[PDB]
Structure formats: C-alpha cells, structure tokens
Design an enzyme around this catalytic site. Structure first.
Site, PDB file in Angstrom:
ATOM      1  N   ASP A 118      44.040  41.070  43.365  1.00  0.00           N
ATOM      2  CA  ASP A 118      45.293  41.383  44.031  1.00  0.00           C
ATOM      3  C   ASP A 118      45.707  40.198  44.896  1.00  0.00           C
ATOM      4  OD1 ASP A 118      45.355  43.874  42.868  1.00  0.00           O
ATOM      5  OD2 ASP A 118      44.262  44.819  44.574  1.00  0.00           O
ATOM      6  N   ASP A 132      40.617  40.573  46.621  1.00  0.00           N
ATOM      7  CA  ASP A 132      41.899  40.657  47.288  1.00  0.00           C
ATOM      8  C   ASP A 132      42.137  39.405  48.116  1.00  0.00           C
ATOM      9  OD1 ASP A 132      42.314  43.466  46.510  1.00  0.00           O
ATOM     10  OD2 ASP A 132      40.459  43.768  47.667  1.00  0.00           O
ATOM     11  N   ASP A 147      37.095  44.480  42.632  1.00  0.00           N
ATOM     12  CA  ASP A 147      38.208  43.566  42.514  1.00  0.00           C
ATOM     13  C   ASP A 147      38.082  42.559  43.648  1.00  0.00           C
ATOM     14  OD1 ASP A 147      39.286  44.684  44.823  1.00  0.00           O
ATOM     15  OD2 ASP A 147      41.347  44.707  44.049  1.00  0.00           O
TER      16      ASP A 147
END
Ligand SMILES: [Mg+2]
Ligand SMILES: [Mg+2]
Ligand code: NA
Length: 327
Positions: free
Chosen positions: A251, A196, A194
């Site tokens: 995120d 961030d 992912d």
DNA sequence: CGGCCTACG
DNA sequence: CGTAG
DNA sequence: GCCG
C-alpha cells in the site's frame, strides 16, 4: 487499574496471554462474518485487554474488574483454564461457514458481503470461484491468481529491499519526497502480509499529484503486477526471490506534510488501536480524529500537529511508541 | 437503551 | 461494493 | 457483547 480504551494502555507485540487472546479473536472474527460488528468489537477488546496484562491469567478470579469481560468472554477463558479448549471456539473453527468465509474474505477484492453471497450460492473453494470467472471483478481475478503468494508472509528483509525500489521511483517523481515504513512493520512485526508506505514532501503542496507519477514509474520498471487523481494505491508488487520472485501486497499513501503526523498515526495501527483512539477522541474529548487531522467541532478548528507526540498530548493521553500500539 | 472509527478507490 | 489501519 |  486497567483502562477501558486500548489507546490508554501499552500493548506490546508479544505478551503473556497468547492462547487466551487467540481464542477470543476467533469469536470476534466469526462475529464479523455474521455482520455483528458490536460483538466483534467486544471480543477484540477483551482479547486486547489480555495482551496488555503484565503476566498470565491463571485463575478466573483475575478477570474480575477487567473491562470488556462479562459472562461470555469470562466463560471462554474459564473453559480454556480448566480444559485447555473452549467448545464454542472449536465448533467455530471446524464449521464450514467459518472456514469458507475466512478463505473467501482473504482474497484481495472480496469482503464479508461478497463472501457471504457466494457462500449462500453454494460456493466453497477457490477452484469453485475460478470456474465462474464471469462472477469476478478484475480486482478479484488478481486476488485469486495471486492468492497463494499473498498467503505467505513477507519478512522484514524483503521490506527493506522494497523500500529502496519505492524510494528510487519516488525520487524521480519528486526529488526531496520521502518514504516512511508504516503498518505492522513499524510496530515491530518481523513478518506481515503486506507492506505499507507513507510518502510526503517537506514543502507543503509539492506532494499534489505525486501518486500517479510514482505508480507510472514503478509500472515502467515492471514491478507492478496489479493496481488501479488519487492518494492511496493498493498494489500487488513483484518481490525478488532467489532465482525467481513472489507477489506481495504493498500500500502506498501520500499526505501533505501538514497532515503527515495524522497519516503516520493512522497507518501505523493497529486497526483496533486506531478505532479505539478515534472513539476515545470523540466520546471522551469531543474531538473528531481521522488520518488527515483532528477537528474541534465547537470552535470549528483543526489542531496543527508536528508529531505523533503532539497528537497524544492534544488528546490528553500518555504517548505510546508504535511498538506499544499492538492492540 | 444507544453506541460501537472514519476515511478513500 | 472494495480497500486501509 | 459489553459499557455507560
Ligand atoms: Mg500492513
Ligand atoms: Mg496494507
Ligand atoms: Na478480502
């Protein structure tokens, strides 16, 4: 010569004990799937000690005196040194319980507790879950739909492209607000599962209400495949690819500038590094650390920090750059 | 033996 | 319950 | 599972 907490020693991204650490991490992961957080922590800590060593472990002798190596972790290493494999590790690897719990917990929206219930119900494959979609939250449905894309790593190339699109939305939402890359990519990873980002504004208080405004703008641009006052957003984003696109987990976190060093420290990780750092703070220094601040519970005061360097100093630790926080 | 990070959605 | 690092 |  090897300190007991991971936040007291540099841990680089790549090291000299990769195979040994990977095997200990299988046992840590399996302990988590059984709800044994204590055993997970020990196996993770032992793996991390090996990552911090300056050369390969070649003989069992070399574990004597290392923190977090007792009878069990030492036997694992011994079997790997003598035979190239550890029978306990291989038994875990091929077990139906490990493989299914790993598959299910990889789904965004599924944790150990949910995965374990499904396992006990006899479910084993992603298609088993798809056939029973009334068992699924909207979050889990998105996680299942996008599972294949989310299983493929993001490259740093992709990250820079994503950051520019986030910066555009953030600049319209609040001119002057900034976007900082955190997580594993800030620690130097070349790939990751992912991305961030940490968002702030140099004028304290201006960041209030910012994240909904950012999310609305990214949704209007058609970039949000899944999300949903708030300050953390766990999204799935559309990432361009040649002639197509792929889903990526992103995120987004907002912090006031007074808290930015704490949020940067927390969101840069690693996960074990931050758990160890908070444990060190409380147990060794009597101070309580989170991603918002550092509290002295006796004077009932919060430390002001202007930088991560300030926080390491407050805690009496030598500074570690992000690239040395790969515990 | 107790303890094992500490939050937000 | 999930999410984060 | 290991530390203190
Ligand atoms: Mg990450
Ligand atoms: Mg993340
Ligand atoms: Na999950």
């Amino acid at each position: 010569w090897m300190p007991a907490y991971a936040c007291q020693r540099p841990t680089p991204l790549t090291h000299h004990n990769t195979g040994l650490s990977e095997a200990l991490e299988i046992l840590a992961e399996a302990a988590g799937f059984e709800g044994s957080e204590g055993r997970l922590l020990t196996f993770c800590r032992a793996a991390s000690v090996l990552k911090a060593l300056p050369s390969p472990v070649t003989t069992l002798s070399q574990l004597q005196g290392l923190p977090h190596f007792g009878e069990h972790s030492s036997r694992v290493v011994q079997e790997l040194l003598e035979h190239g494999v550890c029978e306990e590790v291989e038994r875990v690897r091929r077990s139906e319980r490990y493989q299914t719990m790993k598959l299910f917990t990889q789904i965004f929206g599924v944790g150990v507790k949910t995965a374990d219930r499904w396992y006990r119900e006899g479910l084993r494959t992603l298609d088993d879950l798809r056939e029973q979609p009334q068992k699924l939250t909207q979050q889990q449905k998105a996680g299942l739909q996008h599972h294949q894309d989310l299983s493929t790593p993001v490259l740093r190339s992709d990250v820079d492209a994503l950051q520019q699109v986030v910066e555009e939305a953030v600049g319209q939402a609040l001119p002057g607000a900034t976007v900082t890359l955190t997580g594993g990519f800030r620690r130097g990873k070349l790939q990751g599962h992912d991305v961030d980002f940490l968002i702030t504004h140099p004028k304290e208080g201006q960041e209030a209400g910012l994240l909904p405004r950012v999310m609305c703008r990214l949704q209007d641009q058609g970039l949000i495949l899944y999300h949903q006052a708030f300050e953390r957003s766990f999204c799935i984003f559309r990432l361009p690819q040649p002639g197509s696109w792929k889903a990526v987990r992103v995120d987004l976190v907002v912090a006031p500038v007074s808290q930015f060093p704490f949020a940067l420290l927390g969101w840069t990780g690693s996960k074990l590094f931050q758990r160890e750092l908070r444990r060190f703070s409380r147990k060794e220094k009597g101070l309580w650390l989170n991603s918002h601040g550092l509290f002295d519970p006796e004077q009932k005061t919060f430390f002001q920090a202007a930088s991560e360097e300030d926080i390491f100093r407050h805690l009496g630790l030598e500074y570690l750059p992000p690239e040395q926080r790969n515990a």
